[PDB]
Write an enzyme that holds these catalytic residues in place. Structure first.
Site, short mmCIF file in Angstrom:
data_model
loop_
_atom_site.label_atom_id
_atom_site.label_comp_id
_atom_site.label_asym_id
_atom_site.label_seq_id
_atom_site.Cartn_x
_atom_site.Cartn_y
_atom_site.Cartn_z
N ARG A 1 0.82 -1.18 0.00
CA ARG A 1 0.00 0.00 0.00
C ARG A 1 0.86 1.24 0.00
O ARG A 1 0.59 2.18 -0.72
CB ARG A 1 -0.86 0.05 1.24
N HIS B 1 0.74 4.45 -2.59
CA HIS B 1 0.43 5.80 -2.16
C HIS B 1 1.48 6.89 -2.48
O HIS B 1 1.15 8.06 -2.71
CB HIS B 1 0.13 5.79 -0.65
N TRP C 1 -10.57 -8.64 2.77
CA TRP C 1 -11.29 -8.92 1.53
C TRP C 1 -11.35 -10.41 1.24
O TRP C 1 -11.98 -10.90 0.31
CB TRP C 1 -10.59 -8.25 0.32
C1 HEM Z 1 -9.81 2.56 -6.16
C2 HEM Z 1 -8.59 2.81 -5.70
C3 HEM Z 1 -8.27 2.46 -4.26
C4 HEM Z 1 -9.02 2.68 -3.18
C5 HEM Z 1 -10.06 3.80 -3.00
C6 HEM Z 1 -8.30 2.10 -2.06
C7 HEM Z 1 -8.75 2.14 -0.77
C8 HEM Z 1 -8.08 1.40 0.19
C9 HEM Z 1 -8.43 1.52 1.56
C10 HEM Z 1 -9.65 2.33 2.04
C11 HEM Z 1 -7.60 0.73 2.27
C12 HEM Z 1 -7.63 0.33 3.77
C13 HEM Z 1 -6.86 1.28 4.71
C14 HEM Z 1 -6.89 0.94 6.18
O1 HEM Z 1 -7.92 1.20 6.85
O2 HEM Z 1 -5.81 0.54 6.69
C15 HEM Z 1 -6.81 -0.01 1.34
C16 HEM Z 1 -5.88 -0.92 1.81
C17 HEM Z 1 -5.02 -1.53 0.95
N1 HEM Z 1 -4.77 -1.09 -0.32
FE1 HEM Z 1 -6.20 -0.07 -1.54
N2 HEM Z 1 -7.32 1.26 -2.54
C18 HEM Z 1 -7.30 1.44 -3.90
C19 HEM Z 1 -6.24 1.10 -4.70
C20 HEM Z 1 -5.27 0.20 -4.33
C21 HEM Z 1 -4.28 -0.33 -5.22
C22 HEM Z 1 -4.01 0.14 -6.67
C23 HEM Z 1 -3.39 -0.98 -4.46
C24 HEM Z 1 -2.09 -1.65 -4.87
C25 HEM Z 1 -1.87 -1.99 -6.13
C26 HEM Z 1 -3.89 -1.02 -3.11
C27 HEM Z 1 -3.35 -1.86 -2.14
C28 HEM Z 1 -3.87 -1.97 -0.88
C29 HEM Z 1 -3.36 -2.84 0.17
C30 HEM Z 1 -2.46 -4.06 -0.11
C31 HEM Z 1 -4.07 -2.59 1.26
C32 HEM Z 1 -4.13 -3.34 2.59
C33 HEM Z 1 -3.26 -2.54 3.56
C34 HEM Z 1 -3.22 -3.06 4.96
O3 HEM Z 1 -3.60 -4.24 5.20
O4 HEM Z 1 -2.83 -2.19 5.76
N3 HEM Z 1 -5.15 -0.45 -3.10
N4 HEM Z 1 -6.99 0.54 0.06
#
Ligand code: HEM
Length: 291
Positions: free
Chosen positions: A45, A49, A188
């Site tokens: 993530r 970012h 998920w």
């Molecule tokens: C539509 C675009 C995106 C939205 C709005 C989004 C939104 C989110 C949100 C809301 C979180 C959870 C944050 C938390 O409460 O810790 C999340 C976690 C995550 N995001 Fe996405 N995301 C998107 C794109 C992506 C993409 C492109 C990647 C990587 C290629 C990514 C990889 C991840 C990963 C691996 C986590 C899990 C992090 C953890 O377990 O702390 N996401 N994302």
């Protein structure tokens, strides 16, 4: 704005491989994190970012400058929770102080995927730290309570097409949302720290119920105990997105190849690589090195 990639003076592949191996050994060792999920997900993530702030219009943002290191960026609300990945990386940097920031943040993402059994992601060094004044303003990262149109529009600013977006999204198979961080709560899927096409399968196979959570936001909840953000869900609502989802649901290799390619591109956005720059490196995993 031109961002030419410039190799860290005198470093080679072997130098990079060592930074990689250090991250990896550390991932291995700090397995208790977030209830035994480990730091893989969060590093993935983080690399996304520091890279998603890019703006193809004026070439501002992107991974180059490692501006995450500055307060403005570091304190972005969309960034909540990323501080833990930073903290993970800090000592690594201390051991390898000649690596640029953007190089390190981005390499952590590659290391994470690859050590979590994902595909190999070629990576390029050359990112250069820029000044505090090059720090993009907050607000360039996407919201989660939206739809396919928004998603399409958004990724377009980063030059990603539909296929790239669906590929990239399958990273959602990793980690989980955390209430305190984003206002969403839940994983998920089941194998949350191992890289697979699980994301697509769940989205196509579960019986999702729209509900509000404790932060008063909506999310799709499944009986199995999983969740999907509105943006995740939007991928089955769109005709174009849906068939790609289906394809990945069916062919994990396809998914891996496309992901690989999209991920690199995402991390290489906004950077110019001179003709004499070295080819991209493909790092060995720990296991491949017998370590
Ligand atoms: C539509 C675009 C995106 C939205 C709005 C989004 C939104 C989110 C949100 C809301 C979180 C959870 C944050 C938390 O409460 O810790 C999340 C976690 C995550 N995001 Fe996405 N995301 C998107 C794109 C992506 C993409 C492109 C990647 C990587 C290629 C990514 C990889 C991840 C990963 C691996 C986590 C899990 C992090 C953890 O377990 O702390 N996401 N994302």
């Amino acid at each position: 704005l031109v961002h030419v990639a410039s190799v860290e003076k005198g470093r080679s592949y072997e130098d990079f491989q060592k930074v990689y191996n250090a991250i990896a050994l550390k991932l291995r060792e700090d397995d208790e994190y977030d209830n035994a999920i480990g730091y893989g997900p969060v590093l993935v993530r983080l690399a996304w970012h520091i890279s998603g702030t890019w703006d193809k219009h004026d070439n501002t943002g992107g991974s180059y400058g490692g501006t995450y290191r500055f307060k403005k960026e570091f304190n972005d609300p969309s960034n909540a929770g990323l501080q833990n990945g930073f903290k993970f990386l800090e000592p690594i940097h201390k051991e390898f102080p000649w690596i640029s920031s953007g190089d390190l943040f981005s390499l952590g993402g590659v290391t994470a995927v690859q050590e979590m059994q994902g595909p190999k992601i070629p990576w390029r060094c050359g990112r250069v730290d820029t000044p505090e004044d090059t720090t993009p303003d907050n607000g360039r990262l996407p919201d989660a309570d939206k739809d396919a149109g928004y998603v399409r529009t958004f990724f377009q600013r980063l030059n990603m097409n539909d296929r790239e977006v669906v590929a990239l999204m399958g990273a959602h198979a990793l980690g989980k949302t955390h209430l305190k961080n984003s206002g969403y709560e839940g994983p998920w899927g089941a194998a949350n720290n191992v890289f697979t096409n699980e994301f697509y399968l769940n989205l196509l196979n579960e019986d999702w119920k729209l509900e509000k959570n404790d932060a008063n936001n909506e999310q799709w909840d499944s009986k199995s105990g999983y969740m999907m953000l509105p943006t995740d869900y939007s991928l089955i609502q769109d005709p174009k997105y849906l068939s790609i989802v289906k394809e990945y649901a069916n062919d994990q290799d396809k998914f891996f190849k496309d992901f690989s390619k999209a991920f690199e591109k995402l991390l290489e956005d906004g950077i110019t690589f001179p003709k004499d720059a070295p080819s991209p490196f493909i790092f060995k995993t720990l296991e491949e090195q017998g370590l």
